[PDB]
Amino acid sequence: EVFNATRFASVYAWNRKRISNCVADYSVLYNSASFSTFKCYGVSPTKL
Amino acid sequence: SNFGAISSVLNDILSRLDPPEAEVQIDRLITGRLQSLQTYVTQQLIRA
């Protein structure tokens, strides 16, 4: 709903989406290969 | 104590980080814990 959102904010006024009460699969985002950049700090994209 | 480490707990390092960094955080904890044991023993020898 965020990554495929049809509209993003102007960066000076960037939006903040609250994700809670859900199951978070990040391997589906990482390995979609739709991203040019997917840099996770500390913990790798598929370990988090 | 962390002794410069991100966490006093080995598993907060190992379950999150790849070895190139996890080992660094562990050496910081080893140094601290090893020093604690060495200090302890020296004191035990003196009172002995």
PDB file of C-alpha atoms in Angstrom, chain A residues 19-46:
ATOM      1  CA  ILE A  19       2.358  -0.232  10.238  1.00  0.00           C
ATOM      2  CA  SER A  20       1.089  -2.266  13.197  1.00  0.00           C
ATOM      3  CA  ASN A  21      -1.132  -5.249  14.165  1.00  0.00           C
ATOM      4  CA  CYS A  22       0.062  -7.304  11.122  1.00  0.00           C
ATOM      5  CA  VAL A  23       2.455  -9.906   9.700  1.00  0.00           C
ATOM      6  CA  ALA A  24       5.464  -8.384   8.011  1.00  0.00           C
ATOM      7  CA  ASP A  25       6.999 -10.295   5.182  1.00  0.00           C
ATOM      8  CA  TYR A  26      10.052  -8.419   3.986  1.00  0.00           C
ATOM      9  CA  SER A  27      11.425 -11.169   1.740  1.00  0.00           C
ATOM     10  CA  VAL A  28       8.660 -10.419  -0.704  1.00  0.00           C
ATOM     11  CA  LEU A  29       9.769  -6.826  -0.909  1.00  0.00           C
ATOM     12  CA  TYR A  30      13.474  -7.542  -1.069  1.00  0.00           C
ATOM     13  CA  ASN A  31      13.397 -10.304  -3.648  1.00  0.00           C
ATOM     14  CA  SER A  32      10.860  -8.597  -5.867  1.00  0.00           C
ATOM     15  CA  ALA A  33      13.925  -7.056  -7.544  1.00  0.00           C
ATOM     16  CA  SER A  34      11.726  -4.030  -8.273  1.00  0.00           C
ATOM     17  CA  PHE A  35      14.007  -2.005  -6.098  1.00  0.00           C
ATOM     18  CA  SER A  36      17.347  -0.611  -7.203  1.00  0.00           C
ATOM     19  CA  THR A  37      18.228   0.137  -3.629  1.00  0.00           C
ATOM     20  CA  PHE A  38      17.306  -1.888  -0.569  1.00  0.00           C
ATOM     21  CA  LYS A  39      19.900  -1.069   2.032  1.00  0.00           C
ATOM     22  CA  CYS A  40      19.228  -2.351   5.587  1.00  0.00           C
ATOM     23  CA  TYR A  41      21.385  -1.150   8.393  1.00  0.00           C
ATOM     24  CA  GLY A  42      22.567  -3.552  11.050  1.00  0.00           C
ATOM     25  CA  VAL A  43      20.265  -6.408  10.051  1.00  0.00           C
ATOM     26  CA  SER A  44      20.090  -7.789   6.516  1.00  0.00           C
ATOM     27  CA  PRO A  45      16.778  -7.457   4.473  1.00  0.00           C
ATOM     28  CA  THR A  46      15.890 -11.117   4.877  1.00  0.00           C
TER      29      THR A  46
END
